[PDB]
Design a protein around this ligand. Structure first.
Ligand SMILES: Nc1noc2ccccc12
Length: 167
């Protein structure tokens, strides 16, 4: 049993809810929250900007030190950093950004990072300002992630379309 409430069950391991991931993280304090990161960990907008704002920029400060030591992530890759006030850990995952012309086949590689964690609170990778089709992102998630994933979808209209169209 876990703390996640109000989520619709899609499969054995994947759950979904219309929720603000920031507000959900603040309530649950999950072991892992996933950030929709870019390779530079520049948390300007979208999910990343919202998570970073909720940490009072401490996420960005930590991320800048990580990049100064390690250099940029790979598209499809990830790193584990602090969850600050939101979670124990933040898994920063880089899905491909269609608005930069990145290979959508890298979305499966991005979701494979989730399999290193038994339970996660996450957004749909490459959705929103990353430009991918969220219906596609949900299909890749279900077909790739084997650990227990609780998906927060910010937009009510999109949430209802993801559920209604789910095969
Ligand atoms: N709380 C938020 N502001 O912007 C966002 C974009 C995606 C998900 C959550 C937020």
């Amino acid at each position: 049993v876990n703390s996640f409430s109000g989520y619709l069950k899609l499969t054995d391991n994947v759950y979904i809810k219309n929720a603000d991931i920031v507000e959900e993280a603040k309530k649950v304090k999950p072991t892992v929250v996933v950030n929709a990161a870019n390779v530079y960990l520049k948390h300007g907008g979208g999910v990343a900007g919202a998570l970073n704002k909720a940490t009072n920029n401490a996420m960005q400060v930590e991320s800048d030190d990580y990049i100064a030591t390690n250099g940029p992530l790979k598209v499809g890759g990830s790193c584990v950093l602090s969850g600050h006030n939101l979670a124990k850990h933040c898994l920063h995952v880089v899905g491909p950004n269609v608005n930069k012309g990145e290979d959508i086949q890298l979305l499966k590689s991005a979701y494979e990072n989730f399999n290193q964690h038994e339970v996660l609170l996450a957004p749909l990778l490459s959705a929103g300002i990353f430009g991918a089709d969220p219906i596609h992102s949900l299909r890749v998630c279900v077909d790739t992630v084997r650990t227990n994933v609780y998906l927060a979808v910010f937009d009510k209209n999109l949430y209802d379309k993801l559920v209604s169209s789910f095969l």
